[PDB]
Swiss-Prot record, chains A, B:
Activity regulation, free text: The NAALADase activity is inhibited by beta-NAAG, quisqualic acid, 2-(phosphonomethyl) pentanedioic acid (PMPA) and EDTA. Activated by cobalt.
Name under which the protein is recorded: Glutamate carboxypeptidase 2
Species of origin: Homo sapiens (Human)
Reported cofactor(s): Zn(2+)
Main location: membrane
Effect upon mutating N99A: Loss of glycosylation. Severely reduced enzyme activity
Tissue/organ expression: Highly expressed in prostate epithelium. Detected in urinary bladder, kidney, testis, ovary, fallopian tube, breast, adrenal gland, liver, esophagus, stomach, small intestine, colon and brain (at protein level). Detected in the small intestine, brain, kidney, liver, spleen, colon, trachea, spinal cord and the capillary endothelium of a variety of tumors. Expressed specifically in jejunum brush border membranes. In the brain, highly expressed in the ventral striatum and brain stem. Also expressed in fetal liver and kidney. Isoform PSMA' is the most abundant form in normal prostate.
Glycosylation sites: N22, N67, N86, N99, N141, N282, N405, N422, N584
Topology term for the membrane: Single-pass type II membrane protein
The family this protein is said to belong to: Belongs to the peptidase M28 family. M28B subfamily.
EC number: 3.4.17.21
High-level lineage: Eukaryota, Metazoa, Chordata, Craniata, Vertebrata
Domain notes: The NAALADase activity is found in the central region, the dipeptidyl peptidase IV type activity in the C-terminal.
Length: 694, 694
């Protein structure tokens, strides 16, 4: 028969391994010819696998590259002007790697050019709260300084933006072994740890959901009008460069000024972690000089889009997508997800050749230039927003399959919680000590919900990956799932080798998943979801799950506001309307669930499914959030302090953040009230899309 | 049987006459108790007629009223400060009208308060081109002057805005007999002409699609956050008052300064129509003083919403709506439309009681506060935008049924042209000399298309009535139809008694339509459309008609740009992309029409109908037009020079308007190119919603 189990069993660990190997032998940097070749290979294999159509969708987008003959680097410069120490120009490449000249050296994509010289200030992780600790408690001024920050905790582009707002003239980012060196494991190539010469690449955009910085709102197609560089959407305005911990130890060890405020400011290097500004005594005359010569250039990128037409509802789209472009070899990020996606397409194509079709249309995407700020997925979604708005059922992301081997990790809309729960109860746990047991049980045991026991943790979507435009801008239900580490604490840092040249096929095969069993599990979760979304007669969304979390979120934002009881009284700040809306939503959603069990008639079915599909859409505010016209979801947005994290009721949360330091409290609290009204009105409106239609 | 002819024949002239009489015996000003009583009467009668549900939807919106004990008026003041002439405080009420104290005196709704004194400048109709003629050819400066303008040609709120931008400190509006006195007919009550003491009321908002000036984007519900008056959306910033031609003759006759530039500046009064500034010689010391004491107040308004649930597609909505609030008695505007709407509901209720239901759901609306800037329809649409976006098939307006008795007048989306054509071929002409002939033939004979012969004229939708939010903001196909005069030239002026106290039941019954045959025709057109939209198996929209007009519009905007050939070369201004998009649209639309003839299967039908319904939606740009976030339709917007007129490719047209006077031509032409790209991308995107879905 042609059912989900047939689909799950066609997925093989060995095929995923063949694909991962094939996809990671050379670099696939966005905009390069090698990446275009891999696109043509995907396209032509997805045709062989059996898809109805497979096409390249190209865009000309702003990309960023180092200058091949004027390399980026940082110096310590002395009084006479002599460069007495220089950071490295490239990472020592991994063992057996031949075409070296083609490996992009470490750089921060989208840094402007510049040669600033100054005194160093160490800002910890450069989080909003680290800048508050520096300027407000220690009274240390960053204006005109170079800040050195460690990677981790928050998206690197937030760090750069915090440094800009504090007046810095440059940013050095580095990987501290506290965050990137798991005790008791060896450095690559003998272990999965970061060596001293390894360096994390990555864009430092001030992400705002726009996609190509030159064409916000519209696809970067052939006749596109482009903004000038000066009006470009999220480009940083100070030079930025990343280094490894050997180079960083050389910069940090001379530092003076004030002691670190406490030990959460210390990493593991053998240095005092002085905050600065400047070096101590003997070296107070030395300076740090950055040399950044990277260039911005409009470059062609290619998305592969495969279509598997639905038998019954070909005008309803379930999308499975992940990116193909990598910084270097992309051993984990993204080819461990791309390999899983290839095995899923192969498996759907098999059933297709035996005469089966999904009920709904499935779209498979291999996105380009995700590493440069989600450009391939975002341009495609701007091009097709009208089709996606009226037709998109769900989006499943498939970037990295693993990032550890301890347990499952899932972020998705509440509409998909019950789907995820049911699917994982029917899947085998691949974990040692859990054979015979379900994936749900191992997952629940190792990663418990902080709210309800007997349930696993599912997180909120923010930004940082290609689901972002589907979910935050268009309001299409979205989800992602991968295998992860035990280390809850480092959950936004990346694994040790994240974005460095050492992420290779050997890394995955020797240290992560020799049997490819974690990849197989992940393929089963992402394929299984896509299968159910695409084939279930009633869409597998449970609106009652949205009712439950809305009430946690409302309780939470109310709690944050109540740290200011006197202002709540003086300005009449009331959450009554928002609680009433969440109550109405709870009521209407449970009446709706009953009718959904209690109705054969294709029109009634299409109408109920349309209520389910459009329910996520109903949380979209067409005016967007304040100053953020492309963050339109009123319940979720990327956190303004950490684009990797989702924030709930983001409009109210931003109006409240640091509200005590607003100079006009009447106008600040007026803006909180406005956002309560917007959130209340939107919850009620969404609820009324689930009422009887007439 | 239960078909369209049964529906058409249940409509009776005599019922419309009973309703018109009932609806016009007392004033129904928005926000008054009398208007609320009429709402309760409508609601309870629509229940009797047979609707499934009828509810009041209330909002608290900014309204504007004169001060009952400090009346508005204008003076001529002498050097000593004595007011030597005063305009009247009320219009002489019509014969037999009892409750006088309750008739709102003439005022311009939303004028701020003020007592400016100054010299008069006469600005003709105060159109953009009249201000260009004054300041640019005659070199006359309006700054610090009171402008006196005649009503006509363009929406009064454009006049006030032109006067503000030119530096005026006040505006006097008046009705000139050239525009409001049809030669050879008597003044009311003996004819349908405006008497010397009659005065046109009306709002002077700077309309921008927002609805309630205090709550743009969101419904003015009970917990709404309101902007302060200072940030309010389209409120004028100078005092404005309307007068009749007796009072105006007194203001105009003393005027001096320069002669009128030509005769298109002269009305019919016995005065020289001098432009000013100031009076001649002997009276150069006299001044004009305005006394404006009107107040803005947040007032409750009530929409009546009736639902007739569909038998097969209850989640698809066809809306028939018109307003109920009037300035005074509303003899023509709006009760001649409301009476027709009541007769349509009665007729649908009759079939309903015999067991018939429409295939789609029908919604009937009696909107409030349309006269104060479309507030009832707009707030309701902000409240229900999510339901309307995903479910709205079409909106049919029903303000005034007649405004003359010569021939039919229709404005609608191209998607409805073929529907209008077919329906009117099946309707009788009520015109003398055309008995036995179809409404299409009389209409075509009296009002020919300027493009194709054998077809009648159909105009573009702008603003000025309650369809606006449905069409310009939400992209729901919209239409309107009424009986009109021969006078093509005065097509934006209103009929002579427009918005004055003389628009009464007797006016209509004695001078417009004694037999109520024109109202019956109009009921048949608006009911017929609603019937077809609601009951036809394939939605009666023809996308090939959109392809034809897009190409006229493209030719037209290209022509306007080509008055600047040298700049087109220097800045590489190319319309190639837009012509290619219109060509693709033509091609795809005709392939689509073929599949539409060549397909029983309910899902295939629902999918094709959804392509038709969403086709209007596909022209919506979620970013809106520049500075106009609520004008979102890329093909149509109200004209920036005349909110009553529709402009096609409004983004490009505004970027081009007066482009030679832009100080930075590079930046101005860069903005034209940007708009060509937006229009090209949107036509192509709309076209691709009609492709095979997969
Ligand atoms: C959640 O669902 C509930 C109930 O289903 C919904 O209730 C609505 O609440 C509003 C109040 O916010 C009610 O409004 C009232 O309506 C009546 C007429 O029906 C009016 O008489 C009332 O006005 C008087 O009272 C006001 C407040 O005291 C005065 O300011 C005003 O001047 C009047 O004197 C009042 O407007 C409305 O009837 C109900 N709807 C119902 C019961 O169906 C609630 O709003 C929903 N929550 C959210 C956040 O949407
Ligand atoms: C209306 O429909 C038509 C046809 O159905 C659609 O045609 C598209 O036009 C674009 C050009 O605007 C084509 O783009 C080309 O695609 C090929 C690969 O398929 C590339 O090789 C081309 O790039 C080269 O040429 C460029 C221009 O000379 C260079 O700048 C570039 O560096 C490359 O060397 C080029 O991008 C596209 O293939 C077709 N699509 C088709 C034929 O299906 C047209 O765009 C539609 N009109 C609108 C306004 O959308
Ligand atoms: C737009 C950003 C490009 C790029 N994106 C990217 O490198 N994404 C990785 C991020 C890895 C570290 C943080 N991890 C998470 O934020 C996370 C969220 C949900 C799940 I299930 C698992 C991890 C990525 O998303 O894989 C970057 O961050 O430089
Ligand atoms: C928001 C405006 C409120 C009010 N609206 C209003 O008074 N609308 C009337 C306008 C009558 C004169 C201009 N006529 C037209 O613009 C027109 C357009 C299409 C057709 I078919 C017929 C006439 C109204 O729309 O009836 C006003 O204009 O003061
Ligand atoms: C990855 O896999 C593909 C397909 O299995 C290999 O590409 C094929 O290579 C052979 C030999 O060059 C050709 O005959 C085919 O034209 C290719 N098939 C395609 C492009 O679909 C590819 O070379 C493998 N890559 C690596 C690095 O092993
Ligand atoms: C770091 O790199 C710089 C630049 O390549 C070195 O400084 C240059 O050295 C050569 C040879 O002494 C000079 O002729 C150049 O003019 C120097 N350039 C600059 C910009 O200073 C520097 O010697 C290196 N430092 C170390 C410690 O290796
Ligand atoms: C996940 O599984 C549960 C339990 O099997 C599903 O809930 C049941 O669904 C059937 C079919 O409608 C009902 O008749 C049972 O009463 C439900 N049991 C419950 C709610 O405890 C649930 O619907 C599934 N969720 C999906 C597929 O989204
Ligand atoms: C307009 O028509 C309605 C209904 O035909 C009249 O209202 C009814 O009046 C009688 C006598 O007051 C009452 O018994 C009913 O309660 C009313 N029906 C309603 C409100 O639905 C109304 O009075 C007429 N108005 C005028 C001005 O003639
Ligand atoms: C126009 O109206 C004004 C205001 O009502 C008249 O001026 C007032 O007249 C009385 C009696 O003479 C004075 O005591 C007031 O102080 C005057 N008020 C103002 C504001 O001037 C004026 O007389 C009227 N003019 C005409 C020609 O009727
Ligand atoms: C208006 O009437 C025309 C002519 O009757 C309709 O066009 C015909 O429709 C039938 C049914 O699909 C076709 O088979 C004929 O070939 C059509 N004749 C033509 C195009 O000349 C037209 O569809 C009607 N338009 C509506 C209801 O929107
Ligand atoms: C790279 O190096 C130098 C910098 O001036 C020069 O040869 C070239 O312009 C640079 N390459 C660029 C800007 O693409
Ligand atoms: C800090 O930095 C510079 C010193 O040059 C100064 O201009 C700026 O105002 C200072 N701000 C604070 C809060 O000290
Ligand atoms: C894989 O799991 C094993 C067993 O716990 C362990 O040796 C290793 O640390 C894991 N690999 C990674 C990359 O975490
Ligand atoms: C109307 O007239 C006077 C103006 O000061 C006063 O009695 C009253 O405030 C006014 N009414 C208003 C402002 O509603
Ligand atoms: C016109 O009006 C005033 C005169 O007071 C002046 O300030 C303004 O600049 C003038 N503009 C022109 C174009 O004459
Ligand atoms: C109604 O039509 C007749 C005949 O042409 C004419 O007397 C009259 O002017 C018309 N009424 C109006 C209001 O135009
Ligand atoms: Ca773009
Ligand atoms: Ca509003
Ligand atoms: Cl992922
Ligand atoms: Cl109308
Ligand atoms: Zn990735
Ligand atoms: Zn990455
Ligand atoms: Zn009206
Ligand atoms: Zn009106």
């Amino acid at each position: 028969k042609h059912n989900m189990k047939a689909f799950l069993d066609e997925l093989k660990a060995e095929n995923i391994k063949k694909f991962l190997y094939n996809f990671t032998q050379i670099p696939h940097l966005a905009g390069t010819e090698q990446n275009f070749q891999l696109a043509k290979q995907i396209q032509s294999q997805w045709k062989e696998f059996g898809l109805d159509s497979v096409e390249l969708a190209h865009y000309d987008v702003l990309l960023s590259y180092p200058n091949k003959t004027h390399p980026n680097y940082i110096s310590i410069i002395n009084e006479d002007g002599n460069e007495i120490f220089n950071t490295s120009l490239f990472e020592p490449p991994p063992p057996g790697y031949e075409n070296v000249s083609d490996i992009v050296p470490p750089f921060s994509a989208f840094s402007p050019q510049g040669m600033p010289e100054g005194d160093l200030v160490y800002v910890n992780y450069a989080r909003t709260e680290d800048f508050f600790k520096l300027e407000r408690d220690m009274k240390i001024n960053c204006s005109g300084k170079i800040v050195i920050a460690r990677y981790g905790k928050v998206f690197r582009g937030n760090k750069v933006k915090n440094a800009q707002l504090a007046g810095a003239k440059g940013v050095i980012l580095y990987s501290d072994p506290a965050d990137y060196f798991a005790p008791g494991v060896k450095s690559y190539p003998d272990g999965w740890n970061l060596p001293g010469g390894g360096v994390q690449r990555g864009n430092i955009l001030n992400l705002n959901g726009a996609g190509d910085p030159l064409t916000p709102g519209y696809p970067a197609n052939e006749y596109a009008y482009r903004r000038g560089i000066a009006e470009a959407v999220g480009l940083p305005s100070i030079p930025v460069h990343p280094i490894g911990y050997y180079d960083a130890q050389k910069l940090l060890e001379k530092m003076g000024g004030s002691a670190p405020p406490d030990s959460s400011w210390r990493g593991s290097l053998k240095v005092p972690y002085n905050v600065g500004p400047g070096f101590t005594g003997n070296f107070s005359t030395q300076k740090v000089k950055m040399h950044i010569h990277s260039t911005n250039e409009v470059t062609r990128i290619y998305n592969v889009i495969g279509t598997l037409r639905g038998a019954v509802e070909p005008d309803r789209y379930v999308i499975l997508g992940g990116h193909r472009d990598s910084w270097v070899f992309g051993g984990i990020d993204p080819q461990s997800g791309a390999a899983v996606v290839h095995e899923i397409v192969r498996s759907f194509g098999t059933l297709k050749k035996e005469g089966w079709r999904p009920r709904r249309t499935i779209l498979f995407a291999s996105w380009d230039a995700e590493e440069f700020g989600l450009l391939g997925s975002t341009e495609w979604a701007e091009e097709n927003s009208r089709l996606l708005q009226e037709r998109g059922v769900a989006y499943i992301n498939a970037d990295s399959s693993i990032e550890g081997n301890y347990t499952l990790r899932v972020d998705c809309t509440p509409l998909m919680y019950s789907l995820v729960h049911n699917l994982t109860k029917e899947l085998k746990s691949p974990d040692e000590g859990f054979e015979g047991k379900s994936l749900y049980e191992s997952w629940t045991k190792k990663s418990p919900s902080p709210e309800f026991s007997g349930m696993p943790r599912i997180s909120k979507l923010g930004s940082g990956n290609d689901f972002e435009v589907f979910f935050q801008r268009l309001g299409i239900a979205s989800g992602r799932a991968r295998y992860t580490k035990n280390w809850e604490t480092n959950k936004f840092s990346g694994y040790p080798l994240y974005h460095s040249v050492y992420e290779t096929y050997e890394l995955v095969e020797k240290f992560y998943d020799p049997m490819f069993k974690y990849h197989l599990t992940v393929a089963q979760v992402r394929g299984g979801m896509v299968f159910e979304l695409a084939n279930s007669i009633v869409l597998p969304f449970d609106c009652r799950d949205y009712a439950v979390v809305l009430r946690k979120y409302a309780d939470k934002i109310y709690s944050i506001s109540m740290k200011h009881p006197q202002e709540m009284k003086t300005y009449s700040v009331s959450f009554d309307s928002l609680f009433s809306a969440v109550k109405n939503f709870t009521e209407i959603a449970s009446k709706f669930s009953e009718r959904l069990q209690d109705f054969s008639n294709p029109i009634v079915l299409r109408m109920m499914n349309d209520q389910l599909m459009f329910l996520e859409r109903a949380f979209i505010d067409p005016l967007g959030l304040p100053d953020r016209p492309f963050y339109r979801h009123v319940i979720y947005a990327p956190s303004s302090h950490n684009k990797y994290a989702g924030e709930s009721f983001p409009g109210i949360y931003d109006a409240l953040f640091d509200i005590e330091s607003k100079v006009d409290p009447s106008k600040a609290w007026g803006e909180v009230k406005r956002q309560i009204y917007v959130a209340a009105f939107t919850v009620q409106a969404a609820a009324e899309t689930l009422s009887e239609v007439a």
